C-alpha cells in the first residue's frame, strides 16, 4: 500500500473491473488459490435459489502490454462478506487499495 | 499535523537527521533528510531498447 | 558546482582556525583527521608561479 | 573466456562515433575511446552530458 | 611514556535480547582506533558472513513456479518468496535435503518439515502456505546450500546443467545472516586510565550464527587480507 | 568453499621519490578494497608513532606575536619554519636541541648541533635568514616522540601557566606520512567483470621508506586484532 494516500484509491479500485466484486453479501465457503466460493446470506436468496456463488480468478495470462495479469485471493475461510466487498486483489492492488 | 504526527512518533521534528558514511565512517557535516516515498518501476526496460 | 562554492565558503567561527598551517599538504592533514572544519579561515603558506 | 581477453586487446584504442538523437549541433557528435562495464546501458562521463 | 606498546581489547560483553539480536562489548580500545574497528568489522560483517540458503523446491505436480496447485490459498510464486525468508542452521554438512508434507486444512510452519538432527529451524512457527482442503495435500522437497552473499538464479544457470527434469523449481539465493550493524564508541573506565574506549557493537541476524564467531571469522578474514599487506617487499 | 577468499598480489612498487610513491594492488572483492583503504588512511594519519619538534623557545621574544630584529622571518614565520624539520631520534625517548647563529645569509637546518641520539634527515632546510651579523638568534627547540597529531589548543590550558616567560609551543605532526589517498578501479579477473583494484598514492618526510610506513601500519592493525583470530 501507498502510505500517503489520496483516498481515491478505494474508489478507483472498487469501480475498475481489475477487482472481483462479490455481488452478494454472505459468508466465504470455499477458498482456492484459482477458484472462490461464498454462500450468500439468508436474507439476500431469490425465492427458490442454491444461494452459492463462484467466481474463478485470472491466474496468469498475457495483457494487452504484455504485462502479467493476476488476481490473489484475500479473505479467510468462514470470513462474513458484506456486499461491494472486493473479494480478489488484482495486479497493483492491495485489500481493495491501488497499489502501483 | 505532519509536526504533530512527527513527535507522536518520537523522531525528531526538524525531519532531517544525521547520517554514517558507510565506507568512511564519520558523519556528514549538515543532517540529512530521510524518509519513506512512494516509487514506482516504468515499462521502459532497458533491458528490452538495448 | 555546489561542491565547489560549498568547499570554498568560509564561516566565522570553526573547530581549529586561527592556527597557522606550513602548506597544502598539512591542510589535508588537519582535515580528514576531523580536526578543523572546512570552513575555518587560517593563515597558509602558499607558492605560485608565472 | 580466451573471447573476453581479446575482446579486451581490440577496443585497446579504438574509438567509437556516438550520438544522440536528434543531433542539433556538431558537438552532438563526438567519439570517446571506450572501456567495458557491466549491465545494459552505456557510462557516459558527467561533463559531456551539458 | 610506553608509546611503543598497544594494547589489545577483549569480548568483555556478550548479551543476547532477542535470537535475532545480540549486543556485544570490545574493549579496551584506544584513541582514534574505535572507529577504524567499527567501520572495518561493520563492513565485513554485512559483506562475506557465511550463511544457509534454499536453492531448491520440487512440489507434487508443479510444472513451474507460475502454475497454481488446488488446495493452497496462496500462489506458487508467493510460496516461494516465503520460503527465501526461511532459516536453516546446519554445521555437520555443506548440502542438506529437507521434506514437507501435510494434509490437514490450516497454516503450515517450518516446525512441519521433516528433518534431521542436523538441521534446526531457528524460528520454528515461521508461516509458509495456508490449505483450505480436506481431501487437498502440500508436499514439498526442498534443498539447502551453503554459501556467501547473494548470487541470482540468471547467474545460477550459467552453470548448463544438463537433464534437468521439468519438475524442478529454482529460487534466488541470499546467504548473508546479519540483518543490521551498528556500533557505537565511547570513553571507557578501565585501570583508572583515560584515553581509551568502549566499543558496543549492535547487530540484527536471523538467528542461525552465534555473534562470537561470526565476530571472529570477520577477524580472521580481516586479518588474512591484511596478511598480503605486512608481506609488500 | 567459503572461507577461501580471493588473494592480492603486490603488482608494482611505482617510487616518484624517496618520499613520494604509489602502491597498487588486485584483486580485492567487493568493497574490500575501499575497507583497506579507510583503515589504512586513518591508521597512518592518526596512529603511526612518530618523534617531532613540540617546544621552542627564543631568547628575546615574549609570545607567538613578538619581534626579533635581523631577521626578515616574524616569529610566526620562524617556527612555521621549524615545523617541518625532519629529525628522526635514536632510542632516546625526550630529547633537547640548541642553535644559536650571527651571520648575514641563510641559517640552515644543517646547522643545528648535532647529538649522537638525534639525526636530522633533511639537513639542506632554510631555517631563515638574516639580514646582518650585528644579530644574534639563539633558539632551543625541543623533541618528543608520540602518536598522532596534537594542536595547540590541546595543550594551551590555564594549569599549564606554569611554562617560563619567552616559550612557544609547535604544532607537531609526529606522523612521519604527509599524505595518503586512495582510490579504487573497476578491474576484472577471470570472468568476475566486477572486482575491485586499490591504488595509494603516499608522501612522507624523509625519516621513513614509503614501503617501510605501509608496513608498519599493516603491522600495527594485525596485532591489534591477532587475538580475535581463533586461526594461528
Same mark, same amino acid.
Given at each position: 500500500?501507498?502510505?500517503?494516500?489520496?483516498?481515491?484509491?478505494?474508489?478507483?479500485?472498487?469501480? #475498475?473491473?481489475?477487482?472481483?466484486?462479490?455481488?452478494?453479501?454472505?459468508?466465504?465457503?470455499?477458498?482456492?488459490? #484459482?477458484?472462490?466460493?461464498?454462500?450468500?446470506?439468508?436474507?439476500?436468496?431469490?425465492?427458490?435459489?442454491?444461494?452459492?456463488?463462484?467466481?474463478?480468478?485470472?491466474?496468469?495470462?498475457?495483457?494487452?502490454?504484455?504485462?502479467?495479469?493476476?488476481?490473489?485471493?484475500?479473505?479467510?475461510?468462514?470470513?462474513?462478506?458484506?456486499?461491494?466487498?472486493?473479494?480478489?486483489?488484482?495486479? #497493483?492492488?492491495?485489500?481493495?487499495?491501488?497499489?502501483? | 499535523?505532519?509536526?504533530?504526527?512527527?513527535?507522536?512518533?518520537?523522531?525528531?521534528?526538524?525531519?532531517?537527521?544525521?547520517?554514517?558514511?558507510?565506507?568512511?565512517?564519520?558523519?556528514?557535516?549538515?543532517?540529512?533528510?530521510?524518509? !519513506?516515498? !512512494?516509487?514506482?518501476?516504468?515499462?521502459?526496460?532497458?533491458?528490452?531498447?538495448? | 558546482?555546489?561542491?565547489?562554492?560549498?568547499?570554498?565558503?568560509?564561516?566565522?567561527?570553526?573547530?581549529?582556525?586561527?592556527?597557522?598551517?606550513?602548506?597544502?599538504?598539512?591542510?589535508?592533514?588537519?582535515? @580528514?583527521?576531523?580536526?578543523?572544519?572546512?570552513?575555518?579561515?587560517?593563515?597558509? @603558506?602558499?607558492?605560485?608561479?608565472? | 573466456?580466451?573471447?573476453?581477453?581479446?575482446?579486451?586487446?581490440?577496443?585497446?584504442?579504438?574509438?567509437?562515433?556516438?550520438?544522440?538523437?536528434?543531433?542539433?549541433?556538431?558537438?552532438?557528435?563526438?567519439?570517446?575511446?571506450?572501456?567495458?562495464?557491466?549491465?545494459?546501458?552505456?557510462?557516459?562521463?558527467?561533463?559531456?552530458?551539458? | 611514556?610506553?608509546?611503543?606498546?598497544?594494547?589489545?581489547?577483549?569480548? +568483555?560483553?556478550?548479551?543476547?535480547?532477542?535470537? *535475532?539480536? $545480540?549486543?556485544?562489548?570490545?574493549?579496551?580500545?584506544?584513541?582514534?582506533?574505535?572507529?577504524?574497528?567499527?567501520?572495518?568489522?561493520?563492513?565485513?560483517?554485512?559483506?562475506?558472513?557465511?550463511?544457509?540458503? +534454499?536453492?531448491?523446491?520440487?512440489?507434487?505436480?508443479?510444472?513451474?513456479?507460475?502454475? *497454481?496447485?488446488?488446495? +493452497?490459498?496462496?500462489?506458487?510464486?508467493?510460496?516461494?518468496?516465503?520460503?527465501?525468508?526461511?532459516? +536453516?542452521?546446519?554445521?555437520?554438512?555443506?548440502?542438506?535435503?529437507?521434506?514437507?508434507?501435510?494434509?490437514?486444512?490450516?497454516?503450515?510452519?517450518?516446525?512441519?518439515?521433516?528433518?534431521?538432527?542436523?538441521?534446526?529451524?531457528?524460528?520454528?512457527?515461521?508461516?509458509?502456505?495456508?490449505?483450505?482442503?480436506?481431501?487437498?495435500?502440500?508436499?514439498?522437497?526442498?534443498?539447502?546450500?551453503?554459501?556467501?552473499?547473494?548470487?541470482?538464479?540468471?547467474?545460477?544457470?550459467?552453470?548448463?546443467?544438463?537433464?534437468?527434469?521439468?519438475?524442478?523449481?529454482?529460487?534466488?539465493?541470499?546467504?548473508?545472516?546479519?540483518?543490521?550493524?551498528?556500533?557505537?564508541?565511547?570513553? $571507557?573506565?578501565?585501570?583508572?586510565?583515560?584515553?581509551?574506549?568502549?566499543?558496543?557493537?549492535?547487530?540484527?541476524?536471523?538467528?542461525?550464527?552465534?555473534?562470537?564467531?561470526?565476530?571472529?571469522?570477520?577477524?580472521?578474514?580481516? $586479518?588474512?587480507?591484511?596478511?598480503?599487506?605486512?608481506?609488500?617487499?
Amino acid at each position: 500500500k501507498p502510505l500517503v494516500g489520496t483516498g481515491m484509491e478505494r474508489a478507483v479500485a472498487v469501480d #475498475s473491473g481489475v477487482t472481483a466484486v462479490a455481488k452478494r453479501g454472505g459468508v466465504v465457503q470455499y477458498v482456492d488459490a #484459482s477458484r472462490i466460493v461464498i454462500k450468500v446470506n439468508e436474507d439476500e436468496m431469490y425465492p427458490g435459489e442454491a444461494g452459492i456463488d463462484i467466481y474463478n480468478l485470472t491466474k496468469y495470462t498475457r495483457s494487452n502490454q504484455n504485462t502479467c495479469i493476476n488476481q490473489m485471493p484475500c479473505v479467510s475461510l468462514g470470513e462474513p462478506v458484506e456486499r461491494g466487498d472486493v473479494l480478489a486483489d488484482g495486479p #497493483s492492488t492491495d485489500l481493495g487499495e491501488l497499489a502501483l | 499535523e505532519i509536526k504533530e504526527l512527527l513527535k507522536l512518533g518520537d523522531l525528531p521534528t526538524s525531519g532531517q537527521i544525521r547520517l554514517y558514511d558507510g565506507r568512511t565512517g564519520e558523519q556528514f557535516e549538515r543532517p540529512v533528510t530521510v524518509g !519513506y516515498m !512512494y516509487m514506482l518501476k516504468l515499462n521502459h526496460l532497458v533491458d528490452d531498447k538495448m | 558546482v555546489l561542491g565547489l562554492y560549498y568547499m570554498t565558503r568560509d564561516c566565522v567561527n570553526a573547530k581549529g582556525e586561527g592556527m597557522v598551517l606550513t602548506g597544502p599538504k598539512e591542510a589535508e592533514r588537519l582535515y @580528514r583527521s576531523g580536526l578543523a572544519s572546512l570552513h575555518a579561515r587560517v593563515k597558509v @603558506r602558499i607558492t605560485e608561479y608565472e | 573466456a580466451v573471447v573476453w581477453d581479446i575482446l579486451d586487446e581490440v577496443i585497446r584504442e579504438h574509438p567509437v562515433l556516438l550520438n544522440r538523437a536528434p543531433t542539433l549541433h556538431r558537438l552532438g557528435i563526438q567519439a570517446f575511446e571506450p572501456v567495458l562495464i557491466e549491465g545494459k546501458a552505456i557510462q557516459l562521463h558527467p561533463l559531456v552530458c551539458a | 611514556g610506553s608509546v611503543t606498546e598497544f594494547l589489545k581489547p577483549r569480548l +568483555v560483553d556478550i548479551e543476547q535480547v532477542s535470537s *535475532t539480536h $545480540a549486543k556485544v562489548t570490545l574493549e579496551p580500545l584506544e584513541r582514534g582506533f574505535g572507529h577504524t574497528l567499527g567501520n572495518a568489522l561493520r563492513r565485513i560483517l554485512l559483506s562475506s558472513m557465511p550463511g544457509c540458503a +534454499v536453492t531448491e523446491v520440487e512440489i507434487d505436480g508443479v510444472l513451474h513456479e507460475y502454475s *497454481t496447485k488446488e488446495g +493452497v490459498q496462496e500462489d506458487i510464486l508467493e510460496i516461494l518468496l516465503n520460503l527465501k525468508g526461511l532459516a +536453516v542452521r546446519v554445521q555437520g554438512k555443506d548440502e542438506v535435503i529437507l521434506t514437507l508434507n501435510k494434509s490437514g486444512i490450516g497454516p503450515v510452519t517450518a516446525a512441519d518439515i521433516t528433518h534431521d538432527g542436523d538441521v534446526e529451524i531457528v524460528k520454528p512457527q515461521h508461516v509458509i502456505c495456508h490449505l483450505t482442503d480436506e481431501n487437498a495435500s502440500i508436499s514439498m522437497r526442498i534443498k539447502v546450500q551453503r554459501g556467501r552473499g547473494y548470487v541470482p538464479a540468471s547467474t545460477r544457470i550459467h552453470s548448463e546443467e544438463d537433464e534437468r527434469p521439468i519438475g524442478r523449481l529454482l529460487v534466488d539465493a541470499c546467504y548473508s545472516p546479519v540483518e543490521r550493524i551498528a556500533y557505537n564508541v565511547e570513553a $571507557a573506565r578501565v585501570e583508572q586510565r583515560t584515553d581509551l574506549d568502549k566499543l558496543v557493537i549492535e547487530m540484527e541476524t536471523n538467528g542461525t550464527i552465534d555473534p562470537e564467531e561470526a565476530i571472529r571469522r570477520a577477524a580472521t578474514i580481516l $586479518a588474512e587480507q591484511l596478511e598480503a599487506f605486512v608481506d609488500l617487499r
